[PDB]
């Protein structure tokens, strides 16, 4: 009976990924060990390193990019941000908190504004970059927004960052494995991805980085990940992450079409009600995320309504606030976020609950 | 394939495995307000209580906080970085996750050990008496990962309290093997790690006194009361909790079993000449045997062991700081046991040892 429509918060482990993780669960896995068990573990994580590379359109033997395994997408975002505290940082107004909250710590960080549809103001970006006097610069702009699904024109942004010789990072967490991504083509120096949001289970994630930039570690010790990130590698999670990346990439088209049809179905139904606003309705979005506002309702209350109907959705909001949405309306938002495993029946169940919870 | 390298990592306990698998079809984000999220939150709070019990404390006492980290290394980095702005004192035999802060912390001093690996308490006092900063951290590994040597943490704690220093111990190789009561020991802080006790990788924790505010290394969504952001690794935490409870409930039976294997192994090793058991004559863990064999190269001998399908390892700042010369230090072999090891594993090790080192009992 429980209907899960909150896939942007996390999703379940893909059955094929599950089977693979289980097959490895009786083993001792320390990649730093010189013996046969250790070498087996090391080979697993290097196989994953190549799987992630392939998924992002890059070739590791080219030694143009490095891949550093982190415990989480949050960790990877912190790692790249802290590497530029000694320079000028520029971030979109709609970053995930793992980038955004560095406003409270970084010595020189500026927020690039967005318009009322959530798109980065490229003129404001140029202005900010032109005013900077430090040669070490980082621009960080979320490809696909976790609240609204709004997509930024990363390739265009990258032309601007290259013009001012800024390094360019994008948080890819909500885009990876849903829409095609070629890091080199986009002109990114850095990128963050996370395993649990793509069905690889928790504990696996990565920061991808240009090889002509030396990342300084946050976490020191045994020298894992070429001394960029110490601690015994989470081999099972890394293994899951790799397999989920390869599966999502190989089936990206079939999954895209399936999810997109559910979204079109859901959104055609929602527009039969008054007072429902789809956030970023007029600009490119992910095929899986529908964020709505419903003025003069309190999302905290309505979410309890959903949970009592056995439906898992969520709310958000700095994102809506920075888009120019008023406080009351911002506290009314509901996010429905889909997976390729969702069905037409899930959507219908959501709609029947919606009508009851909103009395319409 | 005989595995005798349990200090580097160990396999997931079969009960822990079954429990992790039972949860693997779920969506688990403790920050989500709905029923799936609340279920995930409940799992991690349950684990928090399981860890507290295993460390001889009650969370409801509100004397300690427990912060889940991805690894023991992460927990060690978090506490160390919290004292970069004060004076830090560490043993000469710390795990690299504490030791390598020598290369970063603005004011860090190394407390020496004697030739058996015991911290020089007189040197500790001297160092603490010389400090002019009120914010001080003493960090001393309870149970050493190379040699198994145990420090007298309770005594050290009296000295730290005399100079009003905070006291952290890396418990990673002691937790779930010997009884530990962090309050009784006088510890402000402690680090533990799930994979080393059969909970699988990805779960670990820094335990901290509730009258000290830890400042975060990793910011974002405010998980773990804003001490450590990032979506919690619920499955690993769950495994960690169950392994902690199992180890703590069976700590006597496991201790006896492991101790007998060690006594068996060490009686056998001492029938060969020029095999030296490191810290033979001071208190050690029941599971770890570190030996030096002068005029051999451990890197070469380990190829021998691998060819005999035996997983062991080598040591070495630890041996160097104990006064062992470079040649002898490069000869060390570590045999580290689990309650899952058998008499047969020991016999197989010894049969390989006799071939690899060309000796019979004399
Ligand atoms: Ca001979």
XYZ file of C-alpha atoms and ligand atoms in Angstrom:
723
model
C 0.000 0.000 0.000
C 2.886 2.446 0.738
C 3.541 4.599 -2.368
C 6.997 6.206 -2.526
C 7.259 9.392 -4.569
C 10.318 11.001 -2.874
C 13.103 9.601 -5.008
C 15.165 12.819 -4.864
C 15.732 12.275 -1.149
C 17.035 8.757 -1.735
C 15.945 5.689 -3.658
C 16.141 1.956 -3.068
C 18.998 -0.281 -4.108
C 18.469 -1.627 -7.599
C 17.783 -5.432 -7.397
C 20.752 -6.206 -9.665
C 22.940 -3.983 -7.475
C 21.582 -5.717 -4.375
C 22.440 -9.156 -5.736
C 25.968 -7.992 -6.558
C 26.539 -6.454 -3.085
C 25.234 -9.589 -1.401
C 27.645 -11.770 -3.430
C 30.594 -9.900 -1.929
C 29.363 -9.794 1.717
C 31.307 -12.740 3.102
C 34.663 -11.233 2.071
C 37.369 -9.289 3.834
C 37.846 -6.180 1.708
C 40.772 -3.829 2.391
C 42.300 -2.417 -0.793
C 45.437 -1.320 1.147
C 46.342 -4.932 2.035
C 49.098 -6.499 -0.170
C 47.762 -10.085 -0.065
C 45.165 -11.737 -2.330
C 42.106 -10.531 -0.506
C 43.389 -6.975 -0.542
C 44.223 -7.146 -4.251
C 40.748 -8.428 -4.963
C 39.237 -5.460 -3.071
C 41.553 -3.034 -4.903
C 40.563 -4.485 -8.282
C 36.875 -3.960 -7.394
C 37.313 -0.263 -6.670
C 39.508 0.337 -9.757
C 36.794 -1.387 -11.878
C 34.272 1.026 -10.386
C 36.602 3.961 -11.064
C 36.498 2.979 -14.769
C 32.699 2.494 -14.641
C 32.194 6.036 -13.321
C 34.597 7.433 -15.923
C 32.760 5.743 -18.776
C 29.432 6.987 -17.438
C 30.644 10.595 -17.494
C 32.187 10.270 -20.976
C 35.812 10.248 -19.836
C 38.782 7.853 -20.146
C 40.989 7.362 -17.053
C 44.123 6.244 -18.931
C 43.991 9.697 -20.600
C 44.954 11.029 -17.115
C 42.833 14.170 -17.742
C 40.567 13.480 -14.759
C 40.911 11.872 -11.349
C 38.094 10.243 -9.386
C 38.131 10.449 -5.593
C 35.707 8.185 -3.670
C 33.949 9.939 -0.782
C 31.359 8.638 1.673
C 28.685 10.981 0.345
C 27.844 13.744 -2.131
C 27.888 16.138 0.802
C 31.472 15.123 1.518
C 32.526 15.622 -2.086
C 30.950 19.099 -2.194
C 32.724 20.065 1.072
C 36.027 18.790 -0.266
C 35.939 20.903 -3.433
C 34.584 23.993 -1.657
C 37.269 23.901 1.074
C 39.888 23.648 -1.609
C 38.938 27.176 -2.737
C 38.463 28.971 0.613
C 41.824 30.651 -0.188
C 40.374 32.046 -3.473
C 37.100 33.566 -4.691
C 34.053 31.296 -4.823
C 30.853 31.945 -6.777
C 27.724 29.751 -6.261
C 24.155 29.759 -7.608
C 21.399 30.972 -5.327
C 19.841 27.511 -5.513
C 22.639 25.142 -4.497
C 22.099 22.165 -2.246
C 22.928 23.075 1.389
C 26.227 21.123 1.096
C 27.470 23.952 -1.208
C 25.169 26.775 -0.106
C 26.056 26.751 3.591
C 29.639 27.581 2.839
C 28.351 31.190 2.780
C 28.790 30.963 6.578
C 32.443 29.858 6.450
C 34.293 30.760 3.262
C 36.224 34.066 3.434
C 35.268 35.189 -0.090
C 32.116 33.720 -1.513
C 29.425 35.378 -3.619
C 25.956 34.186 -4.574
C 24.918 34.380 -8.241
C 21.248 35.287 -8.548
C 18.570 33.361 -10.401
C 15.430 34.586 -12.163
C 11.847 33.664 -11.171
C 12.142 30.387 -13.156
C 15.359 29.406 -11.319
C 17.857 30.052 -14.128
C 21.247 31.539 -13.278
C 21.745 35.136 -14.361
C 24.747 34.851 -16.670
C 25.247 38.610 -16.834
C 25.468 38.702 -13.046
C 27.945 35.810 -13.195
C 30.185 37.781 -15.636
C 29.941 40.915 -13.536
C 31.016 38.955 -10.439
C 33.916 37.272 -12.256
C 35.087 40.571 -13.783
C 35.130 42.229 -10.323
C 37.370 39.480 -8.827
C 41.102 40.232 -8.284
C 42.212 36.752 -7.260
C 43.500 34.392 -9.904
C 42.270 31.310 -7.969
C 38.516 31.185 -8.652
C 35.772 28.556 -8.347
C 32.353 28.702 -9.925
C 29.942 26.078 -8.589
C 26.530 25.652 -10.220
C 24.081 22.816 -9.629
C 23.221 21.121 -12.934
C 19.836 19.780 -11.827
C 18.077 21.243 -8.841
C 16.921 18.814 -6.150
C 13.780 20.782 -5.197
C 12.395 21.863 -8.570
C 14.315 19.790 -11.150
C 15.385 22.959 -12.998
C 18.313 22.473 -15.408
C 21.069 25.051 -15.895
C 22.804 25.558 -19.221
C 26.115 24.248 -17.910
C 27.833 24.335 -21.320
C 27.051 28.028 -21.740
C 28.129 28.790 -18.183
C 31.384 26.954 -18.941
C 32.232 29.307 -21.809
C 31.962 32.196 -19.349
C 34.051 30.462 -16.670
C 36.751 29.622 -19.273
C 36.799 33.273 -20.390
C 37.683 34.439 -16.828
C 39.927 31.410 -16.157
C 37.744 30.237 -13.300
C 37.594 26.617 -12.319
C 34.146 25.146 -12.869
C 32.367 22.650 -10.620
C 28.842 21.321 -10.951
C 26.868 19.305 -8.413
C 25.552 16.538 -10.730
C 23.838 14.529 -8.029
C 20.227 14.830 -9.355
C 21.284 14.669 -13.003
C 23.725 11.728 -13.014
C 22.016 8.609 -14.305
C 18.880 10.500 -15.382
C 20.106 12.743 -18.192
C 23.233 12.323 -20.373
C 26.398 13.964 -19.038
C 29.803 14.332 -20.628
C 32.038 16.176 -18.217
C 34.778 17.007 -20.683
C 32.351 18.307 -23.291
C 30.609 20.493 -20.697
C 33.941 22.079 -19.768
C 33.816 21.083 -16.099
C 36.971 20.920 -13.973
C 35.076 19.319 -11.102
C 31.890 17.413 -10.442
C 30.059 15.726 -7.567
C 27.969 12.525 -7.770
C 26.329 10.245 -5.199
C 25.510 6.559 -5.236
C 22.350 6.292 -3.106
C 20.373 8.731 -5.225
C 20.925 6.436 -8.249
C 20.147 3.027 -6.627
C 23.699 2.072 -5.619
C 23.003 2.160 -1.888
C 24.500 4.479 0.654
C 28.157 5.058 1.331
C 29.506 5.519 -2.177
C 30.040 8.836 -3.913
C 32.761 10.769 -5.705
C 34.378 14.043 -6.545
C 35.654 14.075 -10.107
C 38.571 16.450 -10.685
C 40.847 17.666 -13.435
C 44.311 16.044 -13.229
C 46.069 19.370 -13.583
C 44.638 20.398 -10.176
C 45.927 18.854 -6.903
C 43.106 18.424 -4.397
C 44.257 18.987 -0.800
C 42.674 16.442 1.599
C 40.194 17.180 4.333
C 40.761 13.700 5.838
C 44.273 12.435 6.463
C 45.738 9.143 7.598
C 46.552 6.030 5.634
C 46.889 7.632 2.158
C 43.887 6.050 0.430
C 42.708 7.643 -2.801
C 46.257 8.954 -3.475
C 46.209 10.822 -0.140
C 43.213 12.975 -1.140
C 40.820 11.089 1.114
C 42.058 8.708 3.797
C 40.083 6.014 5.609
C 39.433 2.399 4.666
C 37.457 2.488 1.397
C 33.795 1.397 1.618
C 34.326 -1.320 -1.003
C 30.756 -2.731 -1.066
C 29.220 0.722 -1.436
C 31.758 1.659 -4.131
C 30.974 -1.588 -5.944
C 27.226 -0.831 -5.761
C 27.796 2.728 -6.964
C 29.750 1.470 -9.995
C 27.164 -1.037 -11.054
C 24.318 1.456 -10.594
C 26.182 4.017 -12.710
C 26.708 1.506 -15.550
C 23.074 0.333 -15.445
C 21.610 3.817 -15.365
C 23.820 4.919 -18.233
C 23.147 1.855 -20.372
C 19.376 2.261 -19.887
C 19.241 6.043 -19.751
C 16.901 6.322 -22.740
C 14.318 3.704 -21.689
C 14.332 5.128 -18.142
C 14.037 8.727 -19.398
C 11.009 7.926 -21.552
C 9.267 5.960 -18.832
C 9.746 8.667 -16.212
C 8.904 11.515 -18.572
C 5.508 9.901 -19.416
C 4.659 9.647 -15.682
C 5.580 13.300 -15.189
C 3.428 14.406 -18.155
C 0.561 12.302 -16.734
C 0.941 13.729 -13.210
C 1.292 17.329 -14.363
C -1.719 17.184 -16.751
C -3.760 15.940 -13.779
C -2.476 18.607 -11.355
C -3.433 21.420 -13.741
C -7.105 20.321 -13.479
C -7.065 22.004 -9.985
C -6.989 25.713 -9.258
C -4.293 27.417 -7.311
C -1.579 24.838 -8.191
C 1.695 26.302 -9.491
C 4.380 24.104 -11.021
C 7.754 25.675 -10.198
C 9.994 26.234 -13.278
C 7.102 25.061 -15.521
C 8.388 27.146 -18.433
C 12.083 26.137 -18.518
C 13.958 22.871 -19.004
C 13.600 20.477 -16.029
C 14.527 16.916 -15.139
C 11.964 14.397 -16.403
C 11.239 13.134 -12.864
C 10.600 16.102 -10.549
C 7.439 18.090 -10.016
C 7.552 20.853 -7.435
C 4.263 22.632 -6.813
C 3.124 25.534 -4.614
C -0.445 25.858 -3.370
C -0.952 29.297 -1.843
C -2.678 29.546 1.584
C -1.864 25.976 2.646
C 0.811 24.747 5.027
C 2.942 21.975 3.507
C 3.908 20.631 6.946
C 0.236 19.856 7.607
C -0.496 18.573 4.137
C 2.493 16.214 4.266
C 1.118 14.593 7.298
C -2.089 14.192 5.197
C -0.053 12.376 2.570
C 1.745 10.189 5.048
C -1.636 9.159 6.516
C -2.675 8.174 2.972
C 0.458 6.023 2.798
C 2.188 8.400 0.357
C 5.808 9.555 0.746
C 6.456 12.992 -0.726
C 8.300 16.016 0.685
C 8.511 19.799 0.842
C 11.343 22.319 0.668
C 13.138 27.062 1.341
C 16.159 29.118 0.283
C 15.529 27.917 -3.299
C 11.985 29.277 -3.593
C 12.956 32.412 -1.592
C 15.889 33.166 -3.930
C 13.542 32.722 -6.893
C 11.375 35.562 -5.514
C 8.618 33.420 -4.001
C 7.036 34.914 -0.837
C 7.402 33.183 2.547
C 3.845 31.897 2.918
C 3.837 30.432 -0.635
C 7.297 28.930 -0.103
C 6.023 27.094 3.041
C 3.256 25.544 0.844
C 5.502 23.568 -1.552
C 5.190 19.844 -2.247
C 7.761 17.838 -4.226
C 6.837 14.708 -6.125
C 9.981 13.004 -7.437
C 9.840 9.887 -9.578
C 11.879 6.849 -10.375
C 11.656 4.560 -13.388
C 10.121 2.043 -10.927
C 7.062 4.287 -10.326
C 3.830 3.423 -12.163
C 0.662 5.085 -13.533
C -1.135 3.545 -10.497
C 1.213 5.432 -8.122
C 0.275 8.696 -9.824
C -3.474 7.911 -9.649
C -3.070 7.084 -5.935
C -1.280 10.393 -5.424
C -4.091 12.288 -7.159
C -6.880 10.552 -5.209
C -5.061 11.473 -1.967
C -4.458 15.023 -3.266
C -8.165 15.633 -3.815
C -9.002 14.512 -0.294
C -6.118 16.290 1.465
C -6.770 19.624 -0.378
C -10.605 19.155 -0.396
C -11.010 19.716 -4.160
C 42.604 -19.253 2.118
C 43.378 -18.636 5.806
C 42.741 -15.099 7.039
C 44.820 -13.902 9.994
C 44.718 -10.137 9.343
C 41.666 -9.184 11.328
C 43.160 -5.913 12.550
C 43.058 -4.559 8.999
C 39.377 -5.469 8.592
C 37.164 -8.446 9.207
C 34.152 -9.988 7.472
C 30.562 -9.083 8.184
C 29.137 -11.289 10.927
C 26.478 -13.650 9.389
C 23.761 -12.288 11.722
C 24.740 -8.737 10.782
C 24.666 -9.717 7.105
C 21.118 -11.154 7.380
C 19.963 -7.988 9.154
C 21.509 -5.652 6.506
C 19.997 -7.708 3.715
C 16.504 -7.519 5.320
C 16.651 -3.731 5.064
C 18.003 -3.511 1.473
C 14.730 -2.967 -0.414
C 13.937 0.189 1.640
C 14.387 3.897 1.039
C 16.315 5.119 4.059
C 16.738 8.850 4.691
C 16.457 9.817 8.359
C 15.866 13.487 7.441
C 12.602 12.661 5.527
C 9.425 13.416 7.607
C 7.288 10.555 6.217
C 7.010 6.984 7.423
C 10.038 5.681 5.477
C 12.213 8.454 6.797
C 11.008 7.940 10.365
C 11.760 4.276 10.068
C 15.335 5.130 8.982
C 15.669 7.628 11.848
C 14.463 5.014 14.331
C 17.130 2.580 13.086
C 19.971 5.021 13.661
C 18.703 6.129 17.116
C 18.459 2.446 18.101
C 22.070 2.054 17.053
C 23.015 5.132 19.086
C 21.654 3.386 22.193
C 23.390 0.127 21.261
C 26.766 1.932 21.037
C 26.155 3.696 24.375
C 25.461 0.391 26.108
C 28.528 -1.150 24.565
C 30.654 1.677 26.003
C 29.234 1.230 29.462
C 27.073 4.349 29.405
C 23.375 5.331 29.175
C 22.398 8.005 26.614
C 19.528 9.049 28.857
C 22.238 10.261 31.292
C 22.988 13.020 28.724
C 26.695 13.016 29.550
C 27.783 11.953 26.070
C 26.880 12.529 22.446
C 27.512 10.019 19.678
C 28.312 11.290 16.157
C 28.162 8.829 13.256
C 31.060 9.154 10.812
C 31.869 7.160 7.683
C 35.039 5.722 9.216
C 37.299 5.673 12.257
C 39.728 7.761 10.291
C 36.999 10.387 9.827
C 36.169 10.400 13.576
C 39.875 10.825 14.455
C 40.241 13.686 11.972
C 37.131 15.381 13.389
C 38.330 15.391 17.023
C 41.906 16.335 16.075
C 40.787 19.270 13.931
C 38.664 20.485 16.806
C 41.848 21.142 18.775
C 44.129 22.609 16.085
C 43.420 25.907 17.856
C 44.857 24.444 21.093
C 47.745 22.204 22.178
C 47.586 18.555 21.177
C 49.550 15.701 22.690
C 49.613 12.232 21.071
C 51.356 8.922 21.793
C 54.301 7.959 19.587
C 52.305 4.891 18.442
C 49.026 6.312 17.218
C 47.280 5.061 14.079
C 48.217 7.269 11.104
C 44.759 8.914 11.236
C 45.958 10.646 14.471
C 49.730 10.467 13.951
C 49.861 12.260 10.600
C 48.350 15.367 12.144
C 52.003 16.060 13.090
C 52.230 17.461 9.568
C 49.272 19.829 9.939
C 48.389 20.871 13.469
C 49.967 24.149 14.574
C 50.910 22.910 18.065
C 51.207 19.161 18.437
C 53.702 17.188 20.544
C 54.491 13.503 20.565
C 54.599 11.680 23.891
C 57.297 9.050 23.884
C 56.909 5.362 24.618
C 59.364 2.911 26.202
C 60.793 -0.167 24.419
C 57.665 -2.176 25.307
C 55.338 0.472 23.783
C 54.010 2.010 27.001
C 53.431 5.771 27.154
C 55.946 7.622 29.345
C 53.658 9.259 31.900
C 56.450 11.416 33.307
C 57.004 12.817 29.794
C 53.262 13.370 29.434
C 53.212 15.459 32.671
C 56.266 17.420 31.610
C 54.583 18.244 28.283
C 51.306 19.240 29.918
C 53.109 21.408 32.517
C 54.948 23.228 29.703
C 51.706 24.152 27.847
C 50.363 27.758 28.126
C 47.064 27.248 26.300
C 43.961 26.385 28.280
C 42.463 24.351 25.407
C 44.356 21.027 25.429
C 43.790 17.560 23.969
C 45.563 14.378 24.952
C 44.995 11.534 22.524
C 46.269 8.054 23.358
C 45.419 4.828 21.520
C 43.976 2.295 24.010
C 44.959 -0.808 22.021
C 47.641 -0.617 19.372
C 46.803 -1.935 15.914
C 50.333 -3.267 15.156
C 51.346 -4.898 18.455
C 48.175 -5.108 20.557
C 49.822 -3.195 23.401
C 47.363 -1.736 25.979
C 47.851 1.620 27.674
C 46.719 2.332 31.200
C 44.005 4.722 30.090
C 42.563 5.216 33.593
C 45.919 6.337 34.961
C 46.551 8.604 31.993
C 43.121 10.135 32.634
C 44.100 11.160 36.174
C 47.057 13.071 34.738
C 44.936 14.738 32.039
C 42.381 15.852 34.628
C 45.232 17.300 36.827
C 46.242 19.627 33.970
C 42.660 20.260 32.835
C 43.277 18.652 29.437
C 40.583 16.884 27.442
C 41.155 13.170 26.899
C 40.512 11.163 23.738
C 41.315 7.564 23.073
C 41.258 5.715 19.780
C 39.342 2.555 20.859
C 39.166 0.999 17.421
C 41.199 -2.172 18.202
C 39.796 -2.540 21.739
C 36.059 -2.029 21.184
C 34.160 -5.336 21.113
C 37.241 -7.272 22.254
C 37.852 -6.020 25.778
C 35.339 -4.374 28.173
C 35.271 -0.584 27.981
C 33.449 1.865 30.168
C 34.250 5.325 28.846
C 32.907 7.187 31.874
C 34.867 5.049 34.358
C 38.001 5.553 32.263
C 37.617 9.343 32.414
C 37.483 9.863 28.653
C 36.001 12.987 27.088
C 36.210 11.564 23.588
C 36.573 8.253 21.852
C 36.726 6.783 18.342
C 35.270 3.424 17.176
C 34.791 1.743 13.811
C 32.259 -0.738 12.554
C 34.136 -2.790 9.978
C 36.829 -3.850 12.414
C 34.155 -5.482 14.581
C 32.131 -7.254 11.813
C 29.545 -4.529 11.171
C 30.650 -3.938 7.595
C 32.182 -0.779 6.211
C 30.738 2.688 6.356
C 29.721 2.929 9.997
C 31.813 4.484 12.766
C 31.545 7.090 15.483
C 33.103 9.801 17.557
C 31.830 9.735 21.084
C 32.019 13.091 22.897
C 31.279 14.663 26.233
C 28.022 16.698 26.096
C 29.742 19.672 27.801
C 31.924 20.079 24.693
C 30.562 21.376 21.382
C 32.197 19.672 18.440
C 32.470 21.972 15.415
C 31.837 20.233 12.059
C 34.262 19.401 9.308
C 31.414 18.580 6.944
C 28.511 20.990 6.563
C 25.221 20.887 4.719
C 21.931 19.390 5.788
C 22.493 19.397 9.577
C 22.564 15.649 10.151
C 23.949 14.451 13.494
C 22.933 17.766 15.146
C 25.029 19.698 12.617
C 28.257 18.036 13.689
C 28.481 15.869 10.551
C 26.297 16.504 7.512
C 25.521 14.163 4.651
C 22.831 11.557 4.291
C 23.448 8.977 7.016
C 24.622 5.549 5.843
C 21.730 3.807 7.523
C 22.560 0.204 6.531
C 26.150 0.531 7.761
C 25.033 2.203 10.977
C 22.471 -0.560 11.528
C 25.203 -3.188 10.948
C 27.556 -1.329 13.311
C 24.936 -1.287 16.042
C 24.121 -4.974 15.742
C 27.805 -5.943 15.682
C 28.442 -3.788 18.791
C 25.616 -5.475 20.687
C 26.714 -8.970 19.658
C 30.320 -8.373 20.541
C 29.439 -6.804 23.916
C 26.953 -9.596 24.845
C 29.513 -12.306 23.960
C 32.626 -10.517 25.046
C 33.685 -13.183 27.634
C 33.188 -16.268 25.447
C 34.949 -14.447 22.562
C 37.798 -13.285 24.806
C 38.469 -16.802 26.052
C 38.328 -18.318 22.600
C 40.694 -15.765 21.088
C 43.090 -15.778 24.036
C 43.489 -19.591 23.751
C 44.387 -19.266 20.031
C 46.968 -16.595 20.895
C 48.518 -18.730 23.654
C 48.633 -21.650 21.245
C 50.212 -19.561 18.458
C 52.730 -17.887 20.703
C 53.851 -21.101 22.460
C 54.496 -22.508 18.976
C 56.394 -19.453 17.736
C 58.682 -19.488 20.781
C 59.911 -22.993 19.807
C 61.944 -21.208 17.030
C 65.050 -19.131 17.683
C 65.248 -15.387 16.973
C 61.532 -14.823 16.873
C 60.708 -11.780 19.023
C 57.185 -11.079 20.151
C 56.763 -7.297 20.392
C 55.420 -6.112 23.762
C 55.591 -9.722 25.027
C 56.040 -8.527 28.571
C 53.353 -5.950 28.977
C 49.552 -6.135 28.794
C 48.244 -6.758 25.264
C 45.004 -7.503 23.485
C 44.132 -11.220 23.373
C 44.170 -11.335 19.556
C 47.333 -9.716 18.199
C 50.796 -11.179 17.781
C 53.485 -8.955 16.264
C 56.854 -10.645 15.726
C 60.234 -9.510 14.443
C 62.678 -11.945 12.890
C 66.042 -10.197 12.501
C 67.886 -10.623 9.177
C 64.718 -11.281 7.139
C 62.688 -8.976 4.982
C 58.937 -9.006 5.778
C 58.001 -7.828 2.260
C 59.652 -10.977 0.829
C 58.270 -13.314 3.470
C 54.757 -12.008 2.871
C 55.063 -13.248 -0.737
C 55.800 -16.596 0.883
C 52.656 -16.371 2.987
C 50.489 -15.335 0.062
C 51.734 -18.338 -1.902
C 50.695 -20.524 1.053
C 47.234 -18.903 0.939
C 47.739 -17.098 4.260
C 46.709 -13.456 4.787
C 48.889 -11.687 7.329
C 50.608 -8.304 7.198
C 53.604 -6.311 8.284
C 54.177 -3.443 10.720
C 56.869 1.299 10.856
C 56.702 4.444 12.986
C 55.447 2.253 15.847
C 58.504 -0.026 15.975
C 60.840 2.921 15.208
C 59.387 4.974 18.106
C 59.816 1.962 20.367
C 63.582 2.084 19.626
C 63.668 -0.828 17.163
C 66.356 -0.473 14.481
C 65.419 -0.136 10.822
C 66.503 -3.605 9.696
C 64.588 -5.343 12.488
C 61.538 -3.107 11.943
C 61.372 -4.133 8.250
C 61.206 -7.795 9.446
C 57.881 -7.606 11.319
C 54.890 -9.890 10.740
C 51.484 -9.295 12.362
C 49.101 -12.151 13.030
C 45.741 -10.812 14.195
C 42.863 -13.021 15.217
C 39.119 -13.084 15.403
C 36.787 -15.285 17.438
C 36.078 -16.936 14.041
C 39.659 -18.226 13.752
C 40.325 -21.855 14.636
C 43.158 -24.040 16.041
C 43.427 -25.316 12.454
C 44.157 -21.787 11.148
C 47.034 -21.506 13.639
C 48.428 -24.918 12.661
C 48.263 -23.931 8.989
C 50.074 -20.684 9.791
C 52.837 -22.578 11.630
C 53.240 -25.165 8.871
C 53.704 -22.266 6.374
C 55.975 -20.397 8.828
C 58.350 -23.395 9.095
C 58.691 -23.593 5.282
C 58.944 -19.851 4.641
C 61.534 -19.285 7.392
C 63.237 -22.734 7.036
C 62.905 -23.928 10.664
C 61.566 -26.840 12.642
C 60.800 -26.764 16.357
C 63.875 -27.094 18.530
Ca 66.831 -25.882 4.944
